[PDB]
Write a protein that binds this ligand. Structure first.
Ligand SMILES: OC[C@H]1O[C@H](O[C@H]2[C@@H](O)[C@H](O)[C@@H](CO)O[C@@H]2O)[C@@H](O)[C@@H](O)[C@@H]1O
Ligand SMILES: [Ca+2]
Ligand SMILES: [Ca+2]
Ligand SMILES: [Cl-]
Ligand code: NA
Ligand code: NA
Length: 258
């Protein structure tokens, strides 16, 4: 046929073509999250949009290295150093450092999350931007692990609305990756999610991440249609655009026929 048929039952992921100045990286907003609150981050509504009803702590823009790997301090005989969780032991010490004198259960202040001075022990953050596929085909996003709770959403009207990156969060709970901490204490039952994407369209991307205590971990990757994997550093794939609510043609409801 002269034209492609289109994805069945309007199945294509909505994307966008913002016309404004493109900036490298994602925007990261930080919101208050209570130390040792083991319930708030287990709600879908909280993880999709409720986080923004808490106090906003600040923000940083242009972030391309988006994985989280926050290690709490061990106050040791030789000074204060971050302890990889797998090296913690006993009650407690850190391998190569001896016994730690400090509590695993208090808040700690650090710039480890994107250079922003906050409490990485207890915080929620929202990463927003647009993912630019260089190749048409299936992309599989993943979280290697989640500590404590996280979601990843891709697509117009799922992550956020086209040309409206800076708006308050939309209410969609149609997560691409549901890594929400289960109430039961188990592990989310699936921390990959696949999206079919058309080269050259900008796909809204949102990551919401929460830590309630101690270590914070979120290693983010994407497998490209060519079978290669991009991990942690998404430079060249993620971009931001200032809001332009006036750009009439910004939304591409079906990139397969556009
Ligand atoms: O999943 C909750 C929590 O688990 C682990 O922390 C536990 C323990 O090791 C800590 O001493 C106390 C601090 O109050 O909290 C838990 O009982 C860590 O894996 C942590 O990152 C995680 O949030
Ligand atoms: Ca919409
Ligand atoms: Ca934690
Ligand atoms: Cl040791
Ligand atoms: Na770590
Ligand atoms: Na430290």
């Amino acid at each position: 046929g002269l034209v492609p048929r289109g994805s069945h039952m309007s199945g294509a992921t909505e994307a966008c073509l913002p016309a404004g100045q493109r900036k490298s990286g994602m925007n990261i907003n930080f919101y208050q999250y209570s130390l040792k609150d083991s319930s708030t981050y287990s709600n879908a509504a909280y993880m999709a949009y409720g986080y923004a009803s808490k106090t906003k702590l600040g923000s940083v823009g242009g972030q391309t290295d988006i994985s989280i790997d926050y290690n709490i301090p061990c106050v040791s005989s030789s000074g204060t150093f971050p302890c990889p969780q797998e090296d913690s032991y006993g009650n407690w010490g850190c391998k190569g450092m001896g016994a730690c004198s400090n509590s695993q259960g208090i808040a700690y202040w650090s710039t480890d999350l994107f250079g922003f001075y906050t409490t990485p022990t207890n915080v929620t953050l929202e990463m927003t931007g647009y993912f630019l596929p260089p190749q048409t085909g299936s992309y599989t996003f993943s979280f290697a692990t989640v500590d404590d709770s996280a979601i990843l959403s891709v697509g117009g009207s799922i992550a956020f609305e086209c040309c409206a990156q800076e708006q308050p969060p939309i209410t969609s709970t149609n997560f691409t990756i549901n890594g929400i901490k289960p109430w039961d204490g188990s592990l989310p039952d699936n921390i990959t999610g696949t999206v079919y994407m058309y080269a050259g369209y900008y796909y809204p991307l949102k990551v919401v991440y929460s830590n309630a205590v101690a270590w914070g971990t979120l290693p983010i990757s994407v497998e490209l249609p060519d079978g290669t994997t991009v991990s942690d550093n998404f430079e060249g794939y993620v971009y931001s655009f200032d809001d332009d609510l006036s750009q009439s043609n910004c939304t591409i409801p079906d990139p397969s026929i556009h």
